[PDB]
Swiss-Prot record:
One GO location term (cellular component): cytoplasm
BP-aspect Gene Ontology terms: DNA replication, removal of RNA primer
Gene that encodes it: rnhA
Function: Endonuclease that specifically degrades the RNA of RNA-DNA hybrids. RNase H participates in DNA replication; it helps to specify the origin of genomic replication by suppressing initiation at origins other than the oriC locus; along with the 5'-3' exonuclease of pol1, it removes RNA primers from the Okazaki fragments of lagging strand synthesis; and it defines the origin of replication for ColE1-type plasmids by specific cleavage of an RNA preprimer. Involved in production of retron derived msDNA (a branched RNA linked by a 2',5'-phosphodiester bond to a single-stranded DNA).
One Pfam family cited in the UniProt record for this chain: RNase_H
Sample GO molecular function, one term: magnesium ion binding
Identification of the protein by name: Ribonuclease HI
Species this chain originates from: Escherichia coli (strain K12)
Chain sites annotated for binding Mg(2+) 1: N10, E48, D70
Length: 155
């Protein structure tokens, strides 16, 4: 068995907004949980966020995670933004709530319960689990059943 929890995530969206969905694979305990869902109206950014969210909300105890994703909006949030948003009380420079604060606060709550190592893969050099995620991702966007509540044309 594996000593570290492994998570692979991916999001897709056909429009902006449009139908999109996610693919997430997590190796926890001795199983391979596979997650995927399509949303009728949403964005690429929100699906790449959701990928990462459902995977972590799966962990019921504090674990050491290694999360691998080709998502730059997530990388960006994680390496540049989130730290500042917390300081700023989840607001932008002109004092408005940031875009997708609903999803970033949600991922934030989840990240906070674990020890996370991030692996940022280039879309053309992912691991087989990353490819299967994209595949799951695309399938879902194609047959969406859920509503992405938190979507705002607005802010």
């Amino acid at each position: 068995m594996l000593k570290q929890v492994e998570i692979f995530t991916n999001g897709s969206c056909l429009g902006n907004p449009g139908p999109g969905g996610y693919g997430a694979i997590l190796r926890y305990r001795g199983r391979e949980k596979t997650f995927s869902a399509g949303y009728t109206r949403t964005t690429n950014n929100r699906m790449e966020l959701m990928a990462a969210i459902v995977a972590l909300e799966a962990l019921k105890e504090h674990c050491e995670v290694i999360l691998s994703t080709d998502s730059q909006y997530v990388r960006q949030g994680i390496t540049q933004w989130i730290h500042n948003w917390k300081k700023r009380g989840w607001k932008t420079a002109d004092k408005k709530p940031v875009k997708n604060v609903d999803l970033w606060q949600r991922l934030d709550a989840a990240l906070g319960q674990h020890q996370i190592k991030w692996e940022w893969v280039k879309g053309h050099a992912g691991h087989p689990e990353n490819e299967r995620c994209d595949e799951l991702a695309r399938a879902a966007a194609m047959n969406p059943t859920l509503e992405d509540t938190g979507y705002q044309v607005e802010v």
